Copies of this chain bind each other. A is one copy, B any other.
Amino acid sequence: SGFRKMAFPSGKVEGCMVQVTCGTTTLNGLWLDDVVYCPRHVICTSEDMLNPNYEDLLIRKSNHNFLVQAGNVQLRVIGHSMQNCVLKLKVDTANPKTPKYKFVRIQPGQTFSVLACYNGSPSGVYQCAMRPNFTIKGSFLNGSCGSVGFNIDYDCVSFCYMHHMELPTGVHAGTDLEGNFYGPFVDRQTAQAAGTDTTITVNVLAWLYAAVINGDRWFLNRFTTTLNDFNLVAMKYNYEPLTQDHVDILGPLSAQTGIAVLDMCASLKELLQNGMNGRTILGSALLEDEFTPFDVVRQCSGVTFQ
């Protein structure tokens, strides 16, 4: 038993990370088949980023102004194009380590693993959630841009995130691999408002189920509630409203533990209104919202990938 925030094994993604240099800027790119994907602000200096005209800056560049290096292998750039906020660099060679892969646009509240990289080399791997306001709370230093987020399904890598920027507030924003930002953000160094962030209610509930499965039960009370009654308490505490779709997704956890979903919502409502009174749940003194119901089931059955 036990419950840990677990990232996916990063091997399949490590073999796809390359270094992209344009002028003085170096960042990470993703090499799949014969295309390298990277943030388009690789073509910007630190001064361009204040107000960049990406179409005009890209026109000043040719294929040989893009230095792409995979480990110690230099790749030959034979074409370049801009798709929304990503650059696609066509190279001479197909990546021999290309895994089975998909490009996916995930929804707020879904989670993914981030392979943080610098200069095309992997630094570490951790799990993240796309917040309801479409930011993430990562660990990204200078040079991390182009680091990617992903999920793995047996042998297929679903790429869902590419890192582009840190907002002045210290949170992180990026795109899917078609180059469309999550949220209202733009790849410009300016003040950018993230909306109010809220707690992913269905994720907290799944984590309470994981706690029950692991023997933590002190928070189980003798109340229940209704969906509408819970959502009144949800909006006071900046929690996302619970829908019937979320109740349905929690069905299997309900079935395994024998605790009805609206009964778990009554325990959650008393945790929100009374706090935790110095207690902990699964080693945490806060309510955790970074596990999806599918994450909880995965960790609890021990699914493998290879």
Binding site for B on A (CB under 8 A): 1-11, 14-15, 71, 115-126, 128, 137-144, 166, 170-172, 214-215, 275, 278, 280, 283-286, 299-306
Q: A158 to chain B: closest CB distance in Å?
A: 16
Q: Which of A15, A121, A128, A166 has the most CB of B within 10 A?
A: A121
Within 8 Å CB of A171, what residues of B?
2
Q: A189 to chain B: closest CB distance in Å?
A: 15
Oligomer copy total: 2
Q: A218 to chain B: closest CB distance in Å?
A: 15
Within 8 Å CB of A303, what residues of B?
123
| 25 pairs from A and B in contact (CB 8 Å cutoff) | A1-B141, A1-B170, A4-B124, A4-B126, A4-B138, A4-B139, A5-B126, A6-B125, A7-B7, A8-B124, A9-B115, A9-B125, A10-B11, A11-B14, A11-B15, A117-B304, A118-B302, A121-B305, A121-B306, A122-B305, A122-B306, A123-B304, A139-B299, A141-B300, A170-B214
Select one of B115, B126, B170, B302 contacting A123, CB under 8 A. B302
Decide yes or no: A137 and B285 within 8 Å by CB, A11-B15, A122-B306, A123-B304 being known contacts.
no
Select one of B2, B115, B278, B286 contacting A140, CB under 8 A. B2
Q: Is the CB of B139 within 8 A of A2?
A: yes
State the 8 A-B residue pairs at the shortest beta-carbon distance, nearest first. Answer: A6-B124, A285-B285, A11-B11, A121-B304, A121-B306, A9-B122, A4-B139, A11-B14
Within 8 Å CB of A140, what residues of B?
1-2
Complex CA gap A124/B221 in Å reads 33
Q: Is the CB of B122 within 8 A of A304?
A: yes
Q: Which of A122, A275, A286 has the most CB of B within 10 A?
A: A122
Within 8 Å CB of A305, what residues of B?
121-123
Q: Is the CB of A143 within 8 A of B302?
A: yes
| Extra inter-chain contacts (14) besides given A137-B283, A141-B301, CB under 8 Å | A2-B137, A6-B123, A6-B125, A6-B126, A7-B7, A9-B11, A10-B10, A11-B14, A14-B306, A121-B305, A122-B305, A123-B303, A142-B302, A170-B214
Within 8 Å CB of A301, what residues of B?
141
| Residue on B nearest A117 in the bound complex, by CB | B304
Q: A2 to chain B: closest CB distance in Å?
A: 4
Select one of B7, B9, B283, B284 contacting A14, CB under 8 A. B9
Decide yes or no: A2 and B172 within 8 Å by CB, A7-B7, A299-B139 being known contacts.
yes
